């Protein structure tokens, strides 16, 4: 069938949208090639239409059964829970879209007797009708990109399809529980979300050097949620009923994939209707989950197809890696075609195709890979990195802008062990925090597709549980790392990495006088700016805050807060 019909009807802004980089008196500072950065709009809507509209054939043997079967015998192990409303409630983000039923998110976390009365509304509904198309809103995203003129020009806007605030409490209360615990449970060590950072680093390269000869790739599905079929989404329902469930969860389980996960009618901000999906919505619960079995059955059936040998996965939602045995770069080559082949037949087809890698650093999944550097001692280390482009053209934007999510917050959090994160990002948004005395004021940052809230000033004690102590401490980073960076401060007008150990000194010194807090702060983020350092040894409160979830499942488009 095709993933979406359409009307003719306009997707339309709900807000006023800003596609040119804003500029302040602090823009220059980080970034002088404005005109490279962009934010996409509604007004590219009308071109993504074209690209995720397409017709989907499915065709599924034996081996595509074999380990759907293995799967389901690995999910009928899990037990899971139903959250309460008021449970459910407590996970939506306080700025997450209000119902169209009269209430918002802040009416959701306070418990509001208009939400939760509505709310229980939802649910007996659910429970007593399993037929009925349950309306979604589809919205434009805007996100921030640097130009890349040769690759294309300017990327069109992403959509987003969601249910009501009123739906989203309720797939919390019927799938929360599911979807953060059977991914690990089905996919053991190929799940990606079980994973910080560094845990990531340390599958990859353990993963790697368990091979005779390794070869590894990535596989970039085009259209991820739009190659997803009926079939594809009542399969991932039979391996959620394997579960040891409430009958009430069965029932809205099954309500929730006939009428939302499967598909149904399109409306815009504006009440019109857009048209019909019947692909994957990628702004309910489920979508990370239905899209990490998904593409962990296909790939999984796929390689057995293709012969591979002893291939190890690695697998978060529509991201894909794949690390097997190397039977030469020849064979390597074809045995890539034969498994983008059963892919493809599985409707799953490429948009570039895979190449072969026998270099574990030039590998890139999930937007990233594996380099090395070195700690205090010599020691080489390896950490996770990325190119900087998109972060910095990022940074740029939230440098004049407040926006809804701090990319920069995220970025350093995930990324603190870099170059770049630590002699930029870290440098430039804590300069910025000094000078408006905000040192202390809680923003929201997204990890793994949820949401947080999260002070600045525990940036120390996250990175010290996260990456270890040598995150402060790295040295010595790659030729072809260092290179890369140099090569996108050039590309966008950033300082030179040099301007940037003269700023740290400044904002380390500036930071060490405020005592306290900032000063752990600013002895540790900012060790790498002086000639000679003071020995750092784990902070006292980097235990009491404890990172309870963090790194546990995925919920892109899942509505989640922490
Ligand atoms: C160590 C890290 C894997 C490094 C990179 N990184 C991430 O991959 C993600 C991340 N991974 C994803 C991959 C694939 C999907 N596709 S889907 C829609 O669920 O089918 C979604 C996500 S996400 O929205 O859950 N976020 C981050 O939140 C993040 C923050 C800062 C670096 N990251």
Partial sequence: ????????????????????????????????????????????????????????????????????????????????????????????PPHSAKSKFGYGAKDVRNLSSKAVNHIHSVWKDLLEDTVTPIDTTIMAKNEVFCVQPEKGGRKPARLIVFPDLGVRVCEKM??????????????????????????????????????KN?????????????????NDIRVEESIYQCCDLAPEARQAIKSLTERLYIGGPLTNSKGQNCGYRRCRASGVLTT??????????????????????????????????????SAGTQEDAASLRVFTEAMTRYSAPPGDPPQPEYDLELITSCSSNV??????????????????????????????????????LGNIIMYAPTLWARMILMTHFFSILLAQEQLEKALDCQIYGACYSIEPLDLPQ?????????????????????????????????????????????????????????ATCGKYLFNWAVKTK??????????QLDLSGWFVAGYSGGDIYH
Avoid at 13 to 23: D, F, G, N
Avoid at 464 to 473: I, K, P
Avoid at 475 to 501: D, F, M, Q, T
Wanted: glycine share 4%; hydrophobic share 35%; proline share 4%.
């Fill in 534 to 543: 003071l020995k750092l040894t784990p902070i006292p409160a980097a235990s």
């Fill in 288 to 325: 990370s989950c239905g899209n990490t079995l998904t593409c962990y059955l296909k790939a999984s059936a796929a390689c057995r197809a293709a012969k591979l040998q002893d291939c190890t996965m690695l697998v978060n939602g529509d991201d894909l890696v794949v690390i097997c045995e």
């Fill in 174 to 211: 019927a799938l929360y529980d599911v979807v953060s615990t059977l991914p690990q449970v089905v996919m053991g060590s190929s799940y990606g979300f079980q994973y910080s950072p560094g845990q990531r680093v340390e599958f990859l390269v353990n993963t790697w050097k368990s091979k």
């Fill in 462 to 518: 996250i990175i010290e549980r996260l990456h270890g102590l040598s995150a402060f401490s790295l040295h010595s980073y790659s030729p072809g790392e260092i290179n890369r960076v140099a090569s996108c401060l050039r590309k966008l007008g950033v300082p030179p990495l040099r301007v940037w150990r003269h700023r740290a000194r400044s904002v380390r010194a500036r930071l060490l006088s405020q005592g306290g807090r900032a």
């Fill in 214 to 230: 390794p070869m590894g790739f990535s596989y970039d599905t085009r259209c991820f949620d739009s190659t997803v079929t009926e």
């Fill in 371 to 408: 380099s090395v550097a070195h700690d205090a001692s010599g020691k080489r280390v390896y950490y996770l990195t990325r190119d900087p482009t998109t972060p910095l053209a990022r940074a740029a934007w939230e440098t004049a802008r407040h926006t809804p999510v701090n990319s920069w």
């Fill in 1 to 92: 069938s095709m993933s979406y019909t359409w009307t003719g009807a306009l997707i339309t802004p709900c807000a006023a949208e800003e596609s040119k980089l804003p500029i302040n008196a602090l823009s220059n500072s980080l970034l002088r090639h404005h005109n490279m950065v962009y934010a996409t709009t509604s007004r590219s809507a009308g071109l993504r239409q074209k690209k995720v509209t397409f017709d989907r054939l499915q065709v599924l043997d034996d081996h595509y059964r074999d380990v759907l079967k293995e799967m389901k015998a690995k999910a009928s192990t899990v037990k899971a829970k139903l959250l309460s409303v008021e449970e459910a409630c407590k996970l939506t």
